[PDB]
Amino acid sequence: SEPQDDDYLYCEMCQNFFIDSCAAHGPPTFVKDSAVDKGHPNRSALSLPPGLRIGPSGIPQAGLGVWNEASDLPLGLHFGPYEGRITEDEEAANNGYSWLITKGRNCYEYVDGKDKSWANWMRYVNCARDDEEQNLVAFQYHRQIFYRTCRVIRPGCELLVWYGDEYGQELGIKWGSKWKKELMPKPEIHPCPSCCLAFSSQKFLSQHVERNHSS
Ligand SMILES: [Zn+2]
Ligand SMILES: [Zn+2]
């Protein structure tokens, strides 16, 4: 047996892939949705875990977003699966609430969370606009979409998701290549102490602090 491309997790501290639990850091924590019927009118809002808040986004024109409220979300915390209807209808593609799920050999499906009655709270999470504000990574695991924290998320910071090589077309194009296996050049995360951003180096963090907070 051989794990499939979407059987791996990524440890945000090691910055590398693992199966089941990280040899250095142990098993990741998966947060459970508050349980509610797959069918109620407001299921999505009610599936929200304690500690998070749906409310007006900090991104102009975004509408609603999801905010961290109670306490720090540790680094490498997992949410999901993203819920919705599975479909091959390309109309889903850019409908604002759908993710691509790849099945190998350039085949794809979508999980569509547009309908609040069959989706979960993750439908309200807005996409990051840049690397500095992104604090969640959407990635495929067991043919399903999960979000992991790529930062310590402090109280009052908006949850903002984006994606990379563990998702969609990039994932689909490398499928079967064992590239995750071969990774097992470490990216750096340098968070700002005064706002919700983080930077890829100390230089960039200092320039930011000096333009935005203190010089
Ligand atoms: Zn680790
Ligand atoms: Zn800042």
Swiss-Prot record:
PTM (free text): Mono-methylated; automethylated. Tri-methylated; automethylated. Mono-methylation is predominant; automethylation is lower and slower than H3 peptide methylation and is in a highest S-adenosyl-L-methionine concentration-dependent. There are two major sites for automethylation at Lys-174 and Lys-180. Lysines can be simultaneously methylated, such as Lys-174(me3)/Lys-178(me1), Lys-174(me1)/Lys-180(me1) and Lys-174(me1)/Lys-178(me1)/Lys-180(me1). Automethylation is an intramolecular (cis) process.
UniProt: Zn(2+) 2 binding residues: C192, C195, H208, H213
Compartment annotation: Nucleus; Chromosome
Superkingdom classification of source: Eukaryota
Binding residue positions for S-adenosyl-L-methionine: A62, G63, L64, Y97, N126, C127
UniProt domain SET: residue ranges: 50-164
Effect on the protein of changing K180D: Increases histone-lysine N-methyltransferase activity
Coiled-coil ranges from the UniProt annotation: none
Record-listed N6,N6,N6-trimethyllysine modification sites: K174
Binding residues for substrate: N94, N95, G96, Y97, S98, W99, L100, Y163
Modified residues (N6-methyllysine): K174, K178, K180
Impact after mutating D5Y: Increases histone-lysine N-methyltransferase activity
Positions bound to Zn(2+) 1: C11, C14, C22, H25
Start-end of C2H2-type zinc fingers: 190-213
Assembly notes: Homodimer. Interacts with EHMT2 and CDYL; interaction only takes place when PRDM9 is bound to hotspot DNA. Interacts with CXXC1; this interaction does not link PRDM9-activated recombination hotspot sites with DSB machinery and is not required for the hotspot recognition pathway. Forms a complex with EWSR1, REC8, SYCP3 and SYCP1; complex formation is dependent of phosphorylated form of REC8 and requires PRDM9 bound to hotspot DNA; EWSR1 joins PRDM9 with the chromosomal axis through REC8.
Domain notes: The C2H2-type zinc fingers determine the hotspot localization through its binding to specific DNA sequences. Variations in their sequence affect affinity towards DNA-binding motif.
Family that this chain belongs to: Belongs to the class V-like SAM-binding methyltransferase superfamily.
Function: Histone methyltransferase that sequentially mono-, di-, and tri-methylates both 'Lys-4' (H3K4) and 'Lys-36' (H3K36) of histone H3 to produce respectively trimethylated 'Lys-4' (H3K4me3) and trimethylated 'Lys-36' (H3K36me3) histone H3 and plays a key role in meiotic prophase by determining hotspot localization thereby promoting meiotic recombination. Can also methylate all four core histones with H3 being the best substrate and the most highly modified.
Name of the protein in question: Histone-lysine N-methyltransferase PRDM9
Taxonomy of the source species: Eukaryota, Metazoa, Chordata, Craniata, Vertebrata
Full protein segment contained here: 195 to 413 of 894
